[PDB]
Design a binder for these strands. Sequence first.
RNA 1: GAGGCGUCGAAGCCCGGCCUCCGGGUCGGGUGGAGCCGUCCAUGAGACACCGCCCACUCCCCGCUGUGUGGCUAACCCCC
RNA 2: CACAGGUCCCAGCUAGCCCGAAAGGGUUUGUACUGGGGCCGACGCCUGCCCAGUGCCGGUAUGUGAAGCCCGGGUACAAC
RNA 3: AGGGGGAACGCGGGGAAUUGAAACAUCUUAGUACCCGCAGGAAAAGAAAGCAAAAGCGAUGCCGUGAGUAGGGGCGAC
RNA 4: GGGGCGGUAGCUCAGCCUGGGAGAGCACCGGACUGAAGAUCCGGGUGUCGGGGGUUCAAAUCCCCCCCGCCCCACCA
Lengths: 94, 129, 239, 216
Amino acid sequence: MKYPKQIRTYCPFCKKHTIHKVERVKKRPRSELSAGQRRFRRILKGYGGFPRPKPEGREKPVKKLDLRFRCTECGKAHTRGRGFRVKKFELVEG
Amino acid sequence: VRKGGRKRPRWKGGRKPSKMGQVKYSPKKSLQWIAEEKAARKFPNLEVLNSYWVGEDGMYKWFEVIMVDPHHPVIKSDPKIAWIALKHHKGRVFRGLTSAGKKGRGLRNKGKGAEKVRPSIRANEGKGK
Amino acid sequence: MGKSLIQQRRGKGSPTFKSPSHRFRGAVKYIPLNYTQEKTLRGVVEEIMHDPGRTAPVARVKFENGIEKLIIAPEGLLVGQEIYIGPDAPIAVGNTLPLAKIPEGTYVYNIEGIPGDGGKYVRAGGTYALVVSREPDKVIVQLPSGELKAFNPMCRATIGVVAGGGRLEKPLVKAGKAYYKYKARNKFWPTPRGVKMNAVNHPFGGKEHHPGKPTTTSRRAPPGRKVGHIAARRTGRRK
Amino acid sequence: MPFDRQKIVKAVKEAKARAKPRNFTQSVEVAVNLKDIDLKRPENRFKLEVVLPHGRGKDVKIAVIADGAVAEAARKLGLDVISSAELEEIASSPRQARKLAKKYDFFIAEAPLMPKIGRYLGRYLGPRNKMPVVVPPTLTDLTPIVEKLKKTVRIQLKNNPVVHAPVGTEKMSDEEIAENIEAVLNAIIGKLERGESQVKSVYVKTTMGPAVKIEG
RNA sequence: GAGGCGUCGAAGCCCGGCCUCCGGGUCGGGUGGAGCCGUCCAUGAGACACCGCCCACUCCCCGCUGUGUGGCUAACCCCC
RNA sequence: CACAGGUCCCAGCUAGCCCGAAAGGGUUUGUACUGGGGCCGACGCCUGCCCAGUGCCGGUAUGUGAAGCCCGGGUACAAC
RNA sequence: AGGGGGAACGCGGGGAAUUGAAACAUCUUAGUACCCGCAGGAAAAGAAAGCAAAAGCGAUGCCGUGAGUAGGGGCGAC
RNA sequence: GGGGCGGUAGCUCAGCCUGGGAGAGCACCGGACUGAAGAUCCGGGUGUCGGGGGUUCAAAUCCCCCCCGCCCCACCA
C-alpha cells in the first residue's frame, strides 16, 4: 500500500533510471467536449439505445492503482502498466 | 388565426413510446398557408393569388389573403399579372403553389440540401420537409 | 387496465347520468334587462306553485312589463302580494331591493353573485342567508355554510326567509320512496361498494374483502384517481 | 491627492512633475492593485528588490559581517565590515539611548552567522522589511553590496489587494523618476499571475506633485 | 519618510453632540494668539512628524438595476 | 349484491369535480335543506388502544433546489 | 361562375402496428398501410443570393453511371 | 472522486465571522441531611480546546495537509 514519495525507477524520456515524484492521475469532467458527448444529443427521445445509460452496476469492489510518476529532469508525466489493486492506498514519505 | 402549432387528436392506440409526442411532434406546414386555405374555402369561387402577414397582436396573428375573381376579363387582358386564366391556377392554394406554400415546402433552398425537395417531396417518398 | 369511471361518465353527457330537462320548469331571475337600478318594475304574486324540477315551493310573479317569471317564494306569502324592484321599493318581506337600502340584522335570500344576473347564490327551498355586516365598500353576508362572503352593494336581494324546509330533506323510509326522489333529481343509485368490485372496475378492492390503496387520495393526482376521501385534510374521529 | 483625479490615466513622464513651495522635496509613491493576489505561489507574492536605474535618492543602510576573502571584497566596494559583536548588544537588552537596532535596513552575513541574524534583529526591526530576510538578498557579499549602494528599493506584500513600493524621494530630474517607475512595473508584470490585468491598476503620486493613476 | 504644518489664524484653557474594550479619538461655539511634535526609539509589530493607497464591523446623500407590494385602466378577460 | 339507517370527506358558483382535438360541453330549468366521492349495511346495545411505518393535509426557520436573469473568466466572435 | 364524378398516375397534409434485432425500448418495419383536401392530360419542378475536381460550368425533369462509395446506426441489426 | 455540516473535559457540546493560559451543564467522587421513608443544598477538576504544520503580537477556529461520522451527487480515463 505504502510507496515512497520519491523513488528511483526507469524513465523512457531521458532513457535512464532516475528519481520520479508521485501524485494521482487526475481525470476530466464532461459536458463539452468530445465525440461521445455529441452522441448524447440523440437522448431527445433516445430511450433504449446508447444514450439512455443502459441502467446496470454491478459495479465492482476494487479498482486498480493508477499513479502518475512524474520526471524531475523534464517535468513530463508518465502512466504505465501496473496491476496493484488497492482499496486503501496511502502515499507516505520517502 | 390562433398562435402555436397543431392541436392534434389524442390516441386510443397502444403504441410504442416515442410516438406518443404531441408537442414534441411538430408541423412542417406553415400557419400563413392555413390562413389561405380558410379564406379560399369561405367564398367558393374567389381564388388565392398570395398572402402576407399584416401584423399580429401576440395572442393571435393576422394575415391578408389576396383573392381574385377567376373570371373577369380585366386581369386577363393586361399581362402585368394574368396568371389566373390557366386551369392549374384554379386550386393552386391546397397543393402549395402560392408564396406561403413555396416558402414552407422548402423550395426556398435550391443550392445545398436540395436533394429531397427536388423536384418534389413525394417524388422521393416524403423524405422532404 | 380500467376504464372510465362513474364521475367520468357524467361529464360525457351520458343519458343515465343526465338530468331530464322537460319535466323541469325552474329558474329564477329578477329580470336583468333593466339593470339593478331603475324603479320601473313591479309585479303581483300570481300564484304559489310547485316547481316540479326543484321539488320545492315557488311563486309566480306577473310583471308590469307583462312578463311571467318565477321568484323564489318567501314564508308567509299569500297571493295578491306586491313585489317591487328598484331602490325605490320599501323594505318589506318579499320585496326586492339593492343591499345598500337593506339594513343589517334582517334575513335575506336570492342574492346576486355578480350585479345584474338575477341571483347566483341562495336559491334553495327553505334556506336563507343572514345579513351580518354592511359597509358601503363591501357588504358581508353570512351563507348557509357559515362562511362570510363579500359582495358589492349594487347587487339585488329580497327580504324574508324562503318557504318550506323539513321537506327537502326528510326520512327516505324505504327503497321505493327513495327511488322517487332520484327521478326528481339525478344521482346514480343504487351504487355498490368498491371494496368487492374488482381492481379492474375500481382501484380499491379485489373479489375478497380488503382495500387496495388508502381512501384519502392526493390532490395533485390526475383524473380517474379521485375515489375514497377526495381532497381530505383529515379523516376519522376516534383513536 | 493635491491635484488631478485617480481614475484618469497619464504617461509616466507627465505623472511626475516638479512643483513644490513646501519645505518637503516631493516624496514619490508608486502603489499597485494586484488582481489574483495569493501567497501559495511565490509568483503571486511580490516580495523582492528591484534595482532602480537612477536610485532612490537616499542611501540604504547596509551593515555587513563577512569572514574570509569575502570580507576583503566587501571592503573594496566601500564598506566598514562590522563584527558579530553587534548581535550580542541587540539581543541582550531592550535599551534605548545608544541602541544601533532601529537604524538598519538590511544585513548581509556569511552563512554561519545567519541563524543568529534571524532571531535577534527580527525581534526589534520586524515587519515593514527593516529586518533582513533571505527572499530579498541578505547573503552573498558580492552582488548585494553593489545593489544596496545602487539604492535598490525594498518590497513585501500586504495580502489583499495591494502592494506598494514607493520608489524614493525626488532628488533628480522628472524623467529619471519615470525610468525608476518603469523598473518597478517590469518586475511585477515579469512575475506571472492569473487572468487579465494582473496589475489591475498602477498609480504615481507624491506630496505635492501630480497625483494620478497611470496605465497597467 | 525623523521631520513637517500654520499667522489665511494653532495649540492650551471653557462647554455642547459623541462613541467606547470609561483605551482614547472625533467633532460644532468661543477665550486665545504662536505652537504642539519625534528624535531618544521603549515597542513582537511605529508614528495624527508629514505623504499615499488600503483592510474590520458599519452608516449615509446622489447615479444604475432587479424583484415584492399597493393604486390606475388603455390592452386583455369573465358575468348579464 | 341492493337496501332503509350510520359515518367520514371537499367546495362560495368567474366554485369543486369531470367530459372535449378544438370550438365547446355535463353536473345545472342545481346553489350548501346543494351535489360530488368513498366506507359500512334496518331496529337494540356499543365501537377500546396506538401516527413508530405507509398515505393525506397544513406549515416550514434552516438546508438544498432547475431553466430564465446577472456577474467574473474564456473566445478578435461563439462553444466553454 | 361553383358543388359532384372520373381506370390509375401527380401535388400538399395527417400518419400506425404485427415484423427485424433470435428476447426487448433507440433503431428497424416506413415516410409503408390507412385517412383528408386538390389539379391536369402529364403533373410538378424550372431560368440562379446555384456548382466549387479553385478549374471548368451557367433553367428544369428522367434514364444509365458515380456506389452499396462518403455518412448515419445498442457502432448492433441495419 | 466533488460540495456542505458536526466531531472538544468521562459524555453531549458553547465561543468558531465574536482570536490568547480561557468555556457550560450533566454523569461521576467528596460533604450536609435522615430512625426510616423523602426532598434539597454546599466543594472538585479532567480539552489552547480531533491531528499536524505556517501567517498573526498573544489564533483552538484564518491558510496549507487532513482522519472519523452524516446528507446530496460519481467506473472503462
